[PDB]
Amino acid sequence: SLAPEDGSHRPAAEPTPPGAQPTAPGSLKAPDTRNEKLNSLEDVRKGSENYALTTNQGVRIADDQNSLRAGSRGPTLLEDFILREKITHFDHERIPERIVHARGSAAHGYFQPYKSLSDITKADFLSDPNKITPVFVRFSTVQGGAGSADTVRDIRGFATKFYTEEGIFDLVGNNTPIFFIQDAHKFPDFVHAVKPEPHWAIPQGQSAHDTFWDYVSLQPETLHNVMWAMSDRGIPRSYRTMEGFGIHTFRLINAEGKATFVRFHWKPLAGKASLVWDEAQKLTGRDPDFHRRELWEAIEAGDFPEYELGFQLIPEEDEFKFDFDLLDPTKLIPEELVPVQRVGKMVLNRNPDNFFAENEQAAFHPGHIVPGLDFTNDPLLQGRLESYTDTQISRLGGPNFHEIPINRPTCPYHNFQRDGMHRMGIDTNPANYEPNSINDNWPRETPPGPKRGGFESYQERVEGNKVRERSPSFGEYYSHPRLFWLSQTPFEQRHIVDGFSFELSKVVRPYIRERVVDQLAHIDLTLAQAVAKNLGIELTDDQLNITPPPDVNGLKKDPSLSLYAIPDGDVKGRVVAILLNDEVRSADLLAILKALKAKGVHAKLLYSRMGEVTADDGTVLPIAATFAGAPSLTVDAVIVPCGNIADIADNGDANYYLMEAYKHLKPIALAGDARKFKATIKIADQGEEGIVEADSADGSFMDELLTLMAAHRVWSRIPKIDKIPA
Amino acid sequence: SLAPEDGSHRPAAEPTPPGAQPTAPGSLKAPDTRNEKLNSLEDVRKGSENYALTTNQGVRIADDQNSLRAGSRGPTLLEDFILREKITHFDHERIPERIVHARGSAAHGYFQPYKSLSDITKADFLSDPNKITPVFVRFSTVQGGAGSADTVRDIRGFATKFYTEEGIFDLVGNNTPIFFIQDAHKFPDFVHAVKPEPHWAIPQGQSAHDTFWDYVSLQPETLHNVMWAMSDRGIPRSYRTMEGFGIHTFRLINAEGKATFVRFHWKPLAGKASLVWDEAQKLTGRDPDFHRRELWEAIEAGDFPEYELGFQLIPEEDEFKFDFDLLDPTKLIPEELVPVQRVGKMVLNRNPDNFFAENEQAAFHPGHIVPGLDFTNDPLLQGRLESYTDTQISRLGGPNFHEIPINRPTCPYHNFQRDGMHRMGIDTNPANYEPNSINDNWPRETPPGPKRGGFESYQERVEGNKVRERSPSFGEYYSHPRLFWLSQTPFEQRHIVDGFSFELSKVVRPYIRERVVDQLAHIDLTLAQAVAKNLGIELTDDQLNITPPPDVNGLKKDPSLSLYAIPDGDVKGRVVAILLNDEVRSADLLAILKALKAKGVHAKLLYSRMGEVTADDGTVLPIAATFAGAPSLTVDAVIVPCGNIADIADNGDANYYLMEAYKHLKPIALAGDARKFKATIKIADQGEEGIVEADSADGSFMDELLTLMAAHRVWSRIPKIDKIPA
Ligand code: HEM
Ligand code: HEM
């Protein structure tokens, strides 16, 4: 039962493009990629080659194929300890999934700042451009279970654990700059509303159901983040192509004790890019693991996800100078008002070894801050501090979750805490309390100071009575949704209208749809009317007369809120499908692959069967997947080289591949006789912007294709796609 | 007063068709549907209307919108015990999912036998045709998490908890009559091989990956259940339209002590029906909850799932009379050799009230038998008995899982077991041990007997040495795979070839595909050649010459193994999409809808937007969903009535609706000018079988459509669909 003679069962331990080699554990794929945290896991990494199969007690197993029984057709015997241990371990493999963000995908990397930030913070990880901090990052959806699909419409989580020299800092953020609700007390109400309904546990991975829109209609504070969710921000192309935000205002504290308010940002260096809805929903069926897969394969290819950390900084004295409250997590701070200052770069460059041990058991918590950082009174941040430690006690089995290898600090940790389930550390200290004289009081408290000091909270002034009351300054709900709406391109606005229309059409109780349309009328009449028309609802005269909400500190728009208004495309790490035929013109393929390789764009060679095809010059071309096996949903663009086109001209799947790519606004390039396929997509002898066409695939043909790919999608095609039946 | 004045927020408590009303908890939807188990849950059912909101300690809450803070913009205070309790409960909502069969859907119902089976078993629930036993049934997939999709290719679980007067009996079966493996010792290997791969946790809900086919290629005992998984058995249209089987041979024991060997079957009274692959895969995207939904809605409609329990019975003297071992769970007993005797009927007639409390916490275990049943030495059944109690200790938090309301027997339970986490029962017995005098030895042991006796095991002779050894009688792997193959229709054989070809195409290491193909060549050369051709693999001369395995006791086919060879269609509960236009011929719609209603077939009225359209005669037609919102994947047949066809003739969604339906072999009917859509699907002027067309929807148009629906799909269309780009 052995490995093939040719070694083909084992991936090469070098970077390789997606599909070229089977995927593997990060330490076997990239053994020479290291960082302090990855090295520190070596105490628990376990190999396998050349070792005997044993029980967990170290007893060699002779027959792992059979239970012990009284005769070979007889009853199994109670004394089979080998069977019992193996089955008992299997029986207890599962642990509770995260209450939210159960579905997530993670990787290791490192961070470093561009310059010391000691003027504004004493945080050690921000103190020196040449001090590298290992990180572990998990990206996630919110609503669905661990086994739900990746490319749903949802908010995404973006959690980073920095293993710093002065402690672990977890920056536990999402991919939009606000949240749905103002006070943590409502969190279980909002999450219950979005999650599968309690009677029948439907729907998975979708906000398109009555209870969510019932809560939204009755809680207008939710409308800002609902706008972001209904836009294409809700369906990113990759975790590499979305923004990250800490949402809350936090504090930075410098050595002089000065507090500066801050909001955290991550900028994706691969650019912002999202799917369109029909593509994202069909992709949850064709590959529900698409984002997990794409992230792992990018890292194996060397297309490391990179993000720039940035800070919006507001001096203490400017706390009240905006027309929103800085502590309200449903309000964003527009970059036109407060620019994002670039802080440092994070690069994710190694996949884990074991998903369960490292991803599933990772515990992030926004209370894990370090000296130089502090909280504010944001009432959603405040309540989050009661949750993340608590939930970890059932999910991870008790209070020693920081000893699970992935969660361990790389810096020293010593205290008087003892015992708890699954206690790993064996403490030698004669004392388990302080103050003590029997160990001369060690370990000892450390005064706060400029570097290496103990944690002290900023001495913020508190004055108020003990109340359960929402601050009046939080009671405005329409101006930020409007700012967001007005900052989108026209095609982005169409996509928002379509998201609301699609979701509300799934709400069974029509009055809820009506109540939501009335809320949209308080944001923008054009948005409200367009959603209403799709729902067969007619706005009343009163609704038509609702005064729009005020501008945000005079802003009519802020283009930083759009995915696409400002070009920032990067083609490196994108993928093209190349549709083969049984006599491919090799000069086309040479030019195609050469130009793709120059820009770091991968290719997948597709055909109507697996195996190989031979090109016109005898080159044997291995086939990656069939047209049906790897649909156009999984690539950024489609190229059809010249060759024996009649081979594929009447193939339904090949035609369909182009129809689906066209519908989803992807660039398509057709060389030589492949231009015969123009007829399937109904599109003119003169040509069309978004369709590259020439006699052969040369320098020019490929430059045009790659230019289109840098703009991500062919938005100008949108009016043409409603008539195509795909 | 947030409810609408008109009361439209609340579903009517009467049966209603899918989509007509919002779905609800079973006890509110169908309060008059009762059984002894449903009544016994009354002690824990909790209402809500007219009651004050409280903490779990009973304290009325005043403000459930805010945390307590020092000033309305100030920090949250540790003393907020109301916040703390609410967030703590939320923080601990999740429990571990089942290790396998985590994705499942459940309902309540009842079973009654047709006649007393006292001559062959003393089981009380089978003793009297007027004896009604409540059941709770959970249907499931195997591989995916609780948040994975329903219409994946997989085996399905079919677990029935019978709440009998002599104890709980759990019949824990699947929808194929064999399992992949022979000995329980291999269960963690096989499950690990099918489950997502451990480095990256991909793929979800799919066996289409290297490790699964690696294990299959190395363990030919798996090939029989692999054949069933690759056939359309692996993609049922509904839980109502698949078979059930206990798989193992068990025993029935009568009052005279005679043992009869038995295998258990469930026959779906709705008939057998499956999807086709492209449809199933796309449906995991458009509605991952499709089976859960369709089951819930069938019960809300009164289309109760009904199944007939049947037994294959083999006398003890005939144990060795077959070419296969009766104790081998990779072998089926052909119904040609051993007919299924009809035993009784089960009807599922009420949904749960709360999915988590009743479905997620339900615990089934095949060791839960009752007097009149017993085990055999089947080595897979034997090892199951060590797993199911064990896994419930972590999944359900301890040894008192039988006190979770859904799992409680309805009959008396008394013993000397005490304590354990979560103990609910407060024992008053002075004694907690036996034998005791202090409570006169109560509760007391009961001798075995004809009725109401204690459990005693059948005194089977055991003779052999203590060995971990597979019986030689189990070492035959290809004859049952071949009997299955030869028993399928030609279109079912095509779908089997396509299943293997699609799955192996996703295996990244080509040598694994080649090894699987070599295994296929040991089953049937035509099968092997067809799969090899789709993989670009050429059989060797040695492969072309392998001799086929022998017939199974002289059979070269058994038609009961086919889903479709023997017509068993039932249209009640099925659904048709009706594609509206803005001036529908109202006489067509009256004819269509009343014809459907007469046969219990549901309809969904679809259009390009929500709201209403108006028919030729002013009739107002309410729209259920848009064409994109309720795709053809979700229906069994498509009817386009006459009207203003121009309204929808150039709508890409409307056209594609028909293309998709056509490709997936569904009946389509076109009335009047709707026949203009014939060009979209390339139908000839003189028409074709499976397309119903007339000048109007009158006369025999609806009878013809309904005849096509009773045969499920238009298999003769398969050669046509190849070309179509959809
Ligand atoms: C701005 C608002 C919030 C953001 C950006 C946020 C972000 C996230 C992210 C990204 C994760 C997943 C971390 C991972 O990958 O493991 C998560 C987990 C979680 N969050 Fe939040 N969250 C927010 C609000 C809240 C609130 C208000 C609460 C409760 C008061 C809460 C409770 C939790 C819990 C219980 C988990 C599961 C954590 C675990 O099991 O380890 N979240 N959150
Ligand atoms: C003929 C072969 C088998 C059949 C028909 C079968 C059927 C099933 C079904 C239908 C369920 C889901 C019950 C529900 O809906 O909750 C399940 C659960 C389970 N099965 Fe099996 N199974 C088989 C083999 C085995 C084997 C060999 C083992 C281990 C020795 C095993 C261990 C388990 C475990 C751990 C669960 C989760 C049960 C729970 O958490 O309550 N199964 N099985």
Curated annotation (Swiss-Prot), chains A, B:
Recorded GO MF terms? catalase activity; heme binding; identical protein binding; iron ion binding
Reaction catalysed by this enzyme: 2 H2O2 = O2 + 2 H2O
Q: Which PROSITE patterns match?
A: CATALASE_1, CATALASE_2, CATALASE_3
Q: What induces it?
A: By entry into stationary phase.
Q: What is its main location?
A: cytoplasm
The cross-link described as 3'-histidyl-3-tyrosine (His-Tyr) comes at: H365-Y388
- Which first-to-last residue range defines the signal peptide? none
Question: One GO biological process from the UniProt record?
Answer: response to oxidative stress
CC per GO annotation: cytoplasm; cytosol
Q: Which UniProt keywords apply?
A: Cytoplasm, Heme, Hydrogen peroxide, Iron, Metal-binding, Oxidoreductase, Peroxidase
Positions of heme binding: Y388
Subunit (UniProt): Homotetramer.
- What is the purpose of this protein? Decomposes hydrogen peroxide into water and oxygen; serves to protect cells from the toxic effects of hydrogen peroxide.
Q: What is this protein called?
A: Catalase HPII
User: Corresponding gene?
Assistant: katE
